[PDB]
Amino acid sequence: TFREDFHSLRAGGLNWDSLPLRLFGKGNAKFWDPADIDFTRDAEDWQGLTEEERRSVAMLCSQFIAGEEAVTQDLQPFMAAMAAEGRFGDEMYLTQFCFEEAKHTQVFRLWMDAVGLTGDLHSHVAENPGYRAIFYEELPRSLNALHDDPSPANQVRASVTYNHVVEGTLALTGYFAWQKICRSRGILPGMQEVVRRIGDDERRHMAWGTFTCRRHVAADESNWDVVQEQMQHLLPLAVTQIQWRPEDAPEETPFRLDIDELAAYASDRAGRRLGAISAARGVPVEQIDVD
Amino acid sequence: TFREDFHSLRAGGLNWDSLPLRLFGKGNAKFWDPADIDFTRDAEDWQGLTEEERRSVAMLCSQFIAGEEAVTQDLQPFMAAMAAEGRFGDEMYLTQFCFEEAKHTQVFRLWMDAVGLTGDLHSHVAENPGYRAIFYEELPRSLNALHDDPSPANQVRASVTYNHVVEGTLALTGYFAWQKICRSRGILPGMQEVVRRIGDDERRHMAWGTFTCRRHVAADESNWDVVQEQMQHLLPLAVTQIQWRPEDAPEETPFRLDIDELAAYASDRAGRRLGAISAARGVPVEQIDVD
Numbered sequence: 001t002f003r004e005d006f007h008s009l010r011a012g013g014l015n016w017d018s019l020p021l022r023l024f025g026k027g028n029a030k031f032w033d034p035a036d037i038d039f040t041r042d043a044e045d046w047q048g049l050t051e052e053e054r055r056s057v058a059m060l061c062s063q064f065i066a067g068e069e070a071v072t073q074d075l076q077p078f079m080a081a082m083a084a085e086g087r088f089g090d091e092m093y094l095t096q097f098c099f100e101e102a103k104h105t106q107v108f109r110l111w112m113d114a115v116g117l118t119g120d121l122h123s124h125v126a127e128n129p130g131y132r133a134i135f136y137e138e139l140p141r142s143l144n145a146l147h148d149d150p151s152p153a154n155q156v157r158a159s160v161t162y163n164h165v166v167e168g169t170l171a172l173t174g175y176f177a178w179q180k181i182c183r184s185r186g187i188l189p190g191m192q193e194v195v196r197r198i199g200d201d202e203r204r205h206m207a208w209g210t211f212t213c214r215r216h217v218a219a220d221e222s223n224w225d226v227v228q229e230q231m232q233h234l235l236p237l238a239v240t241q242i243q244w245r246p247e248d249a250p251e252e253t254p255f256r257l258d259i260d261e262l263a264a265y266a267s268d269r270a271g272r273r274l275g276a277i278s279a280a281r282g283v284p285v286e287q288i289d290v291d
Numbered sequence: 292t293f294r295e296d297f298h299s300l301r302a303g304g305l306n307w308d309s310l311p312l313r314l315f316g317k318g319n320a321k322f323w324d325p326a327d328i329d330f331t332r333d334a335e336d337w338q339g340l341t342e343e344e345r346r347s348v349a350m351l352c353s354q355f356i357a358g359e360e361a362v363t364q365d366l367q368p369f370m371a372a373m374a375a376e377g378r379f380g381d382e383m384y385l386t387q388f389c390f391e392e393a394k395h396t397q398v399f400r401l402w403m404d405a406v407g408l409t410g411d412l413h414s415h416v417a418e419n420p421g422y423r424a425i426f427y428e429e430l431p432r433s434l435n436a437l438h439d440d441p442s443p444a445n446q447v448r449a450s451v452t453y454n455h456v457v458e459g460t461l462a463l464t465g466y467f468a469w470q471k472i473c474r475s476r477g478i479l480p481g482m483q484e485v486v487r488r489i490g491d492d493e494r495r496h497m498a499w500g501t502f503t504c505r506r507h508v509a510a511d512e513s514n515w516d517v518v519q520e521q522m523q524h525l526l527p528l529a530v531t532q533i534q535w536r537p538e539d540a541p542e543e544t545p546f547r548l549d550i551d552e553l554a555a556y557a558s559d560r561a562g563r564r565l566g567a568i569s570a571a572r573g574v575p576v577e578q579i580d581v582d
């Protein structure tokens with residue numbers, strides 16, 4: 001009762017022109033190893049930051065690494081959904097995606113080790129109601145709903161949560177924050193490289209999510225309503241996450257950052273996700289999903 | 292009800308000395324891209340083979356690619372089991388493992404495309420009762436049993452099936468067969484490279500499986516009885532798979548292969564798996580699993 005054929009033995013083999021398999025090939029060509037990045041200069045720069053600056057960097061790094069860990073775990077029901085859909089190229093892509101998230105977890109962990117952020121860091125994520133809502137609750141709920149029901153609507157809700165909010169709104173805003181922190185000051189060249197490489201990977205993750213939502217919208221435009229509903233539900237939580245300040249928080253945010261600017265940037269990113277997905281409305285599904 | 296902390300934010304971070312994380316690092320250092328292998332000479336060699344030789348090579352290649360596809364899908368419940376055990380380093384490793392199997396599927400598919408094996412090839416696996424029993428039935432049954440019950444005993448049964456039989460008995464015998472086919476004749480240099488690279492990856496897969504079984508045996512030596520029972524159940528099926536001949540089968544196996552020699556080699560590989568796992572009997576678990 002488990003398997004009756006193999007996609008890889010069908011006539012015509014695997015469709016290398018499919019979006020997931022093109023992304024798989026790009027990810028192989030662009031592979032990078034966290035172990036090759038030297039963090040010694042970052043450790044020196046870390047010592048020159050003020051305490052308030054270290055706290056803000058630790059908070060951003062903690063939000064990132066916990067998020068990379070979360071997606072590493074929470075993507076897995078999508079792999080099983082693609083197995084149920086019979087979509088083996090998408091399943092293959094998701095294996096690379098998931099591994100890439102484990103590798104992102106690794107790289108942040110190595111950076112933290114290098115600068116000495118080796119105590120318990122949960123206070124930087126667990127006290128933020130927006131972060132908790134997304135990464136402790138909404139992300140795993142939406143992705144695990146695919147186990148009992150891998151319907152197009154649930155796939156779109158899961159992809160909006162994972163690819164269009166967690167990645168395509170929050171991670172992108174985080175990369176912008178890192179750029180503001182590091183470029184203004186010429187600090188943390190290792191982290192600058194991390195951000196470049198993880199961002200390269202993220203563009204493929206986001207392309208997969210855009211493809212997933214587009215093909216479902218093309219097949220049944222009711223799924224566009226689902227995309228908008230899920231985004232309207234989640235975006236306020238993402239904005240809350242960005243605007244949160246700890247009890248210990250300085251009146252002046254370090255690095256001359258404007259947290260409300262970050263929130264506005266995030267809203268713009270979310271709008272771009274919606275716009276990309278909206279382009280599939282009225283397109284025949286076979287022109288998006290060659291399969 | 293889904294997540295309450297993050298392994299990556301705990302004091303002491305991730306334990307890079309753990310076996311799974313050492314393997315993860317090795318896999319990153321040894322990454323290879325299927326797209327970098329030139330199969331043009333293999334295509335020329337393919338044209339010089341007899342029909343009977345092509346049929347035998349197609350059979351071996353089909354058994355491999357379908358097996359790579361099977362493990363790509365069927366490993367995934369182990370990732371969820373490690374999430375349940377709270378074993379995040381093992382989960383990270385399994386993401387690389389799973390991706391590597393997708394990449395093995397890719398490389399065989401590219402080789403098949405290059406030589407022109409692009410029709411339906413199910414006749415080469417679906418008619419073999421040993422192959423069917425393992426790859427259609429026993430592998431997915433044993434691995435999916437971890438969803439409702441990720442107990443040590445079920446983990447050992449799943450790892451014996453996946454790592455010690457599918458990989459550590461059958462794949463290793465298949466690599467030996469490829470070596471016999473290609474080295475005796477100086478043919479298929481692309482496939483020779485494929486076999487070297489996939490074999491390198493397999494040694495890490497098998498090391499993970501050896502570790503998994505060892506730590507469970509060390510914790511509860513009743514799991515040694517489970518290892519032996521599962522191996523005694525599966526090895527006859529693996530031998531049947533190797534000895535199978537199609538209806539169309541020549542009286543003389545091509546390439547001067549002796550199928551019963553391959554079966555004996557497989558039995559020796561299985562014995563080596565058991566011997567490796569048996570070394571954990573009586574070892575305190577903390578000396579295997581530093582965690």
Ligand SMILES: CCCCCCCCCCCCCCCC(=O)O
Binds near residue numbers: 166167202
């Ligand atoms: C100092 C103020 C910082 C404000 C916070 C900016 C938003 C950071 C969000 C990080 C979430 C990380 C998600 C990772 C997901 C992925 O890797 O695929």
Ligand SMILES: CCCCCCCCCCCCCCCC(=O)O
Binds near residue numbers: 351354358359465468
């Ligand atoms: C011409 C006779 C050939 C005899 C068959 C030899 C055995 C081949 C078995 C191949 C199984 C492949 C399993 C792959 C698993 C993995 O990649 O992890």
Ligand SMILES: [Fe+3]
Binds near residue numbers: 205
């Ligand atoms: Fe991502």
Ligand SMILES: [Fe+3]
Binds near residue numbers: 392458492493
């Ligand atoms: Fe393997």
Ligand SMILES: [Mn+3]
Binds near residue numbers: 198
């Ligand atoms: Mn990431």
Ligand SMILES: [Mn+3]
Binds near residue numbers: 359391392395489
């Ligand atoms: Mn393999």
